[PDB]
Amino acid sequence: ERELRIPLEYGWQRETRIRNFGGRLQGEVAYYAPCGKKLRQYPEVIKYLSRNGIMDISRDNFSFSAKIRVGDFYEARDGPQGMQWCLLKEEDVIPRIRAMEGR
Amino acid sequence: RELRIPLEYGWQRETRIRNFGGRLQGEVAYYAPCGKKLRQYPEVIKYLSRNGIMDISRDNFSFSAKIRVGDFYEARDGPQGMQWCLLKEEDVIPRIRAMEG
Protein backbone atom coordinates (compact mmCIF):
# COMPACT_ATOMS: atom_id res chain seq x y z
CA GLU A 1 0.00 0.00 0.00
CA ARG A 2 2.96 2.37 0.84
CA GLU A 3 4.20 1.68 -2.76
CA LEU A 4 0.82 2.43 -4.40
CA ARG A 5 0.20 5.60 -2.29
CA ILE A 6 3.44 7.35 -3.48
CA PRO A 7 1.75 8.84 -6.61
CA LEU A 8 -1.00 10.46 -4.43
CA GLU A 9 1.89 12.18 -2.52
CA TYR A 10 3.02 13.57 -5.96
CA GLY A 11 -0.51 14.99 -6.61
CA TRP A 12 -1.95 12.12 -8.72
CA GLN A 13 -5.49 10.81 -8.08
CA ARG A 14 -6.61 7.14 -8.11
CA GLU A 15 -10.33 6.44 -8.80
CA THR A 16 -12.21 3.08 -8.72
CA ARG A 17 -15.73 3.04 -10.32
CA ILE A 18 -17.86 0.05 -9.19
CA ARG A 19 -20.85 -1.27 -11.18
CA ASN A 20 -23.14 -4.14 -10.06
CA PHE A 21 -23.91 -6.07 -13.34
CA GLY A 22 -26.89 -8.12 -12.02
CA GLY A 23 -25.56 -9.07 -8.53
CA ARG A 24 -21.88 -9.20 -9.73
CA LEU A 25 -19.63 -6.26 -8.69
CA GLN A 26 -17.02 -5.06 -11.24
CA GLY A 27 -14.54 -2.18 -10.79
CA GLU A 28 -12.59 -0.01 -13.23
CA VAL A 29 -9.50 1.94 -12.04
CA ALA A 30 -8.26 5.22 -13.60
CA TYR A 31 -5.46 7.55 -12.57
CA TYR A 32 -5.43 11.31 -13.09
CA ALA A 33 -1.91 12.76 -13.52
CA PRO A 34 -1.20 16.00 -11.55
CA CYS A 35 -2.17 18.04 -14.72
CA GLY A 36 -5.62 16.32 -14.75
CA LYS A 37 -4.81 13.89 -17.65
CA LYS A 38 -6.88 10.64 -17.25
CA LEU A 39 -4.79 7.39 -17.59
CA ARG A 40 -6.62 4.05 -17.93
CA GLN A 41 -3.81 1.39 -18.26
CA TYR A 42 -0.05 0.77 -17.56
CA PRO A 43 1.11 1.64 -21.10
CA GLU A 44 -0.68 5.03 -20.72
CA VAL A 45 1.06 5.65 -17.36
CA ILE A 46 4.56 4.64 -18.74
CA LYS A 47 4.13 6.98 -21.75
CA TYR A 48 3.06 9.82 -19.44
CA LEU A 49 6.10 9.29 -17.14
CA SER A 50 8.44 9.00 -20.26
CA ARG A 51 6.93 12.04 -22.09
CA ASN A 52 7.08 14.12 -18.83
CA GLY A 53 10.63 13.15 -17.60
CA ILE A 54 9.24 11.63 -14.33
CA MET A 55 11.81 9.25 -12.75
CA ASP A 56 11.10 9.52 -8.96
CA ILE A 57 8.08 7.12 -9.47
CA SER A 58 7.83 4.13 -11.86
CA ARG A 59 5.37 1.46 -13.11
CA ASP A 60 5.88 -0.22 -9.63
CA ASN A 61 3.98 2.71 -7.97
CA PHE A 62 0.77 2.01 -10.01
CA SER A 63 -1.95 -0.70 -10.07
CA PHE A 64 -5.23 -0.97 -12.02
CA SER A 65 -6.60 -3.62 -9.56
CA ALA A 66 -10.09 -2.59 -8.33
CA LYS A 67 -9.39 -4.68 -5.13
CA ILE A 68 -6.71 -2.20 -3.79
CA ARG A 69 -7.98 0.13 -0.98
CA VAL A 70 -6.01 3.15 -2.31
CA GLY A 71 -7.68 6.39 -3.50
CA ASP A 72 -11.39 7.13 -4.07
CA PHE A 73 -14.27 4.63 -4.72
CA TYR A 74 -17.52 5.53 -6.55
CA GLU A 75 -20.77 3.64 -7.17
CA ALA A 76 -23.55 4.74 -9.60
CA ARG A 77 -26.73 6.16 -7.94
CA ASP A 78 -29.84 7.61 -9.64
CA GLY A 79 -31.37 10.98 -8.78
CA PRO A 80 -33.18 14.01 -10.27
CA GLN A 81 -30.16 14.65 -12.65
CA GLY A 82 -30.02 10.93 -13.56
CA MET A 83 -27.10 8.52 -12.80
CA GLN A 84 -24.08 10.02 -10.95
CA TRP A 85 -20.85 8.54 -9.60
CA CYS A 86 -21.31 8.81 -5.78
CA LEU A 87 -18.27 8.63 -3.45
CA LEU A 88 -18.21 5.63 -1.08
CA LYS A 89 -17.29 6.56 2.50
CA GLU A 90 -13.95 4.75 3.23
CA GLU A 91 -15.81 2.44 5.69
CA ASP A 92 -18.24 1.21 2.88
CA VAL A 93 -15.38 0.28 0.44
CA ILE A 94 -14.35 -2.98 2.25
CA PRO A 95 -17.54 -4.97 1.41
CA ARG A 96 -17.12 -3.94 -2.28
CA ILE A 97 -13.45 -5.19 -2.33
CA ARG A 98 -14.44 -8.41 -0.45
CA ALA A 99 -17.24 -9.14 -3.03
CA MET A 100 -14.62 -8.92 -5.88
CA GLU A 101 -12.02 -11.23 -4.13
CA GLY A 102 -11.97 -15.00 -4.82
CA ARG A 103 -13.59 -15.60 -8.25
CA ARG B 1 -8.60 29.89 -18.74
CA GLU B 2 -6.77 31.79 -15.92
CA LEU B 3 -8.59 29.57 -13.32
CA ARG B 4 -7.47 26.35 -15.14
CA ILE B 5 -3.71 27.20 -14.93
CA PRO B 6 -3.27 25.99 -11.28
CA LEU B 7 -4.99 22.66 -12.21
CA GLU B 8 -2.22 22.06 -14.81
CA TYR B 9 0.39 22.42 -11.96
CA GLY B 10 -1.47 19.74 -9.91
CA TRP B 11 -3.82 21.96 -7.83
CA GLN B 12 -7.39 20.52 -7.51
CA ARG B 13 -10.54 22.77 -7.33
CA GLU B 14 -13.63 21.21 -5.64
CA THR B 15 -17.12 22.72 -5.11
CA ARG B 16 -19.38 21.04 -2.51
CA ILE B 17 -23.14 21.74 -2.79
CA ARG B 18 -25.36 21.19 0.30
CA ASN B 19 -29.19 21.40 0.09
CA PHE B 20 -30.48 23.02 3.35
CA GLY B 21 -34.34 22.70 3.10
CA GLY B 22 -34.30 23.50 -0.67
CA ARG B 23 -31.71 26.34 -0.26
CA LEU B 24 -28.45 25.22 -2.03
CA GLN B 25 -25.13 26.37 -0.43
CA GLY B 26 -21.90 25.99 -2.49
CA GLU B 27 -18.43 25.89 -0.91
CA VAL B 28 -15.08 25.83 -2.81
CA ALA B 29 -11.79 24.27 -1.64
CA TYR B 30 -8.42 24.07 -3.40
CA TYR B 31 -5.95 21.22 -2.74
CA ALA B 32 -2.38 22.47 -3.32
CA PRO B 33 0.01 20.10 -5.22
CA CYS B 34 1.18 18.88 -1.68
CA GLY B 35 -2.51 17.97 -0.89
CA LYS B 36 -2.92 20.84 1.65
CA LYS B 37 -6.61 21.97 1.64
CA LEU B 38 -7.05 25.77 1.28
CA ARG B 39 -10.44 27.45 1.85
CA GLN B 40 -9.76 31.24 1.71
CA TYR B 41 -7.75 33.73 -0.47
CA PRO B 42 -5.40 34.75 2.44
CA GLU B 43 -4.43 31.03 3.01
CA VAL B 44 -3.85 30.69 -0.79
CA ILE B 45 -1.65 33.90 -0.85
CA LYS B 46 0.27 32.76 2.34
CA TYR B 47 0.78 29.33 0.64
CA LEU B 48 2.14 31.02 -2.60
CA SER B 49 4.52 33.25 -0.46
CA ARG B 50 5.64 30.40 1.94
CA ASN B 51 6.33 27.86 -0.89
CA GLY B 52 7.80 30.36 -3.42
CA ILE B 53 5.29 29.38 -6.17
CA MET B 54 5.03 32.57 -8.25
CA ASP B 55 3.89 31.56 -11.84
CA ILE B 56 0.27 31.98 -10.46
CA SER B 57 -1.35 34.70 -8.29
CA ARG B 58 -4.76 35.83 -6.88
CA ASP B 59 -6.16 36.15 -10.46
CA ASN B 60 -5.68 32.33 -11.02
CA PHE B 61 -7.99 31.52 -8.05
CA SER B 62 -11.69 31.85 -7.24
CA PHE B 63 -13.63 30.70 -4.15
CA SER B 64 -16.93 31.48 -5.94
CA ALA B 65 -19.22 28.34 -6.04
CA LYS B 66 -20.73 29.66 -9.37
CA ILE B 67 -17.57 28.93 -11.54
CA ARG B 68 -17.60 25.80 -13.85
CA VAL B 69 -13.96 24.83 -13.08
CA GLY B 70 -12.96 21.66 -11.21
CA ASP B 71 -15.20 18.90 -9.85
CA PHE B 72 -18.65 19.56 -8.26
CA TYR B 73 -20.08 17.26 -5.56
CA GLU B 74 -23.61 17.44 -4.11
CA ALA B 75 -24.47 15.88 -0.69
CA ARG B 76 -27.24 13.29 -1.31
CA ASP B 77 -29.05 11.21 1.37
CA GLY B 78 -29.40 7.48 0.51
CA PRO B 79 -29.27 3.83 1.68
CA GLN B 80 -25.61 4.34 2.94
CA GLY B 81 -26.55 7.74 4.50
CA MET B 82 -24.89 11.02 3.32
CA GLN B 83 -22.81 10.63 0.14
CA TRP B 84 -21.02 13.14 -2.06
CA CYS B 85 -22.29 12.61 -5.63
CA LEU B 86 -19.98 13.80 -8.46
CA LEU B 87 -21.96 16.15 -10.77
CA LYS B 88 -21.67 15.14 -14.43
CA GLU B 89 -20.38 18.01 -16.62
CA GLU B 90 -24.04 18.56 -17.86
CA ASP B 91 -25.26 18.67 -14.16
CA VAL B 92 -23.26 21.75 -13.07
CA ILE B 93 -24.96 24.74 -14.84
CA PRO B 94 -28.47 23.54 -13.77
CA ARG B 95 -27.37 23.26 -10.05
CA ILE B 96 -25.60 26.70 -10.19
CA ARG B 97 -28.88 28.14 -11.65
CA ALA B 98 -30.81 26.31 -8.81
CA MET B 99 -28.46 28.05 -6.27
CA GLU B 100 -29.54 31.50 -7.63
CA GLY B 101 -33.37 30.97 -8.04
Side-chain angles (χ1 to χ4, degrees):
Chain A
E1 169 163 1
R2 271 110 260 106
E3 253 284 26
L4 293 180
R5 280 181 182 283
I6 295 284
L8 278 42
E9 293 153 39
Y10 277 78
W12 294 66
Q13 298 311 325
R14 192 174 187 275
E15 151 185 306
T16 303
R17 295 186 162 171
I18 296 198
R19 295 155 181 96
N20 190 318
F21 290 125
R24 195 172 205 258
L25 282 192
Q26 311 290 152
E28 190 160 53
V29 172
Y31 286 85
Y32 302 78
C35 56
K37 196 189 172 85
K38 189 175 188 194
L39 304 176
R40 291 186 269 255
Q41 52 180 128
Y42 269 100
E44 282 180 25
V45 176
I46 308 308
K47 289 194 215 167
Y48 183 90
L49 295 180
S50 294
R51 227 169 64 242
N52 289 96
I54 304 182
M55 294 195 82
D56 286 15
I57 65 178
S58 73
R59 64 201 298 284
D60 306 316
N61 301 110
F62 296 83
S63 170
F64 286 93
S65 175
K67 298 135 67 155
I68 307 296
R69 292 173 73 220
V70 169
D72 304 305
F73 283 71
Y74 300 82
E75 199 167 68
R77 306 203 151 255
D78 206 349
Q81 296 197 292
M83 243 41 62
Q84 292 172 324
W85 295 110
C86 300
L87 184 72
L88 295 173
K89 304 190 316 307
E90 264 193 313
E91 62 254 40
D92 283 319
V93 173
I94 284 164
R96 269 113 268 247
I97 303 307
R98 280 209 68 221
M100 294 186 192
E101 289 175 335
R103 78 191 216 170
Chain B
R1 12 273 211 76
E2 289 327 304
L3 294 181
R4 286 192 186 281
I5 290 175
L7 273 54
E8 296 172 36
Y9 291 106
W11 292 72
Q12 284 170 289
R13 187 181 189 273
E14 134 175 320
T15 307
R16 287 179 170 189
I17 299 173
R18 287 167 153 111
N19 189 337
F20 295 107
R23 293 98 195 294
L24 293 186
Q25 308 289 146
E27 144 188 297
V28 179
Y30 282 88
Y31 301 86
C34 70
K36 174 163 191 72
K37 187 177 189 183
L38 301 159
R39 288 171 255 214
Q40 44 173 143
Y41 295 111
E43 281 188 321
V44 165
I45 297 303
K46 292 175 324 217
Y47 182 98
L48 289 186
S49 295
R50 193 182 75 246
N51 291 104
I53 290 152
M54 225 43 252
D55 291 13
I56 63 191
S57 57
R58 168 66 174 73
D59 275 321
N60 296 93
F61 288 96
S62 174
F63 282 104
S64 159
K66 295 157 145 87
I67 306 285
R68 312 171 62 218
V69 168
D71 294 324
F72 280 65
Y73 292 92
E74 185 164 350
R76 286 274 314 291
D77 219 337
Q80 317 301 106
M82 253 31 78
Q83 278 184 95
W84 292 110
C85 294
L86 178 71
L87 293 200
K88 301 183 294 307
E89 284 203 344
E90 60 268 31
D91 291 346
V92 177
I93 284 151
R95 296 311 276 150
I96 293 163
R97 290 173 63 113
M99 288 206 216
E100 302 164 344

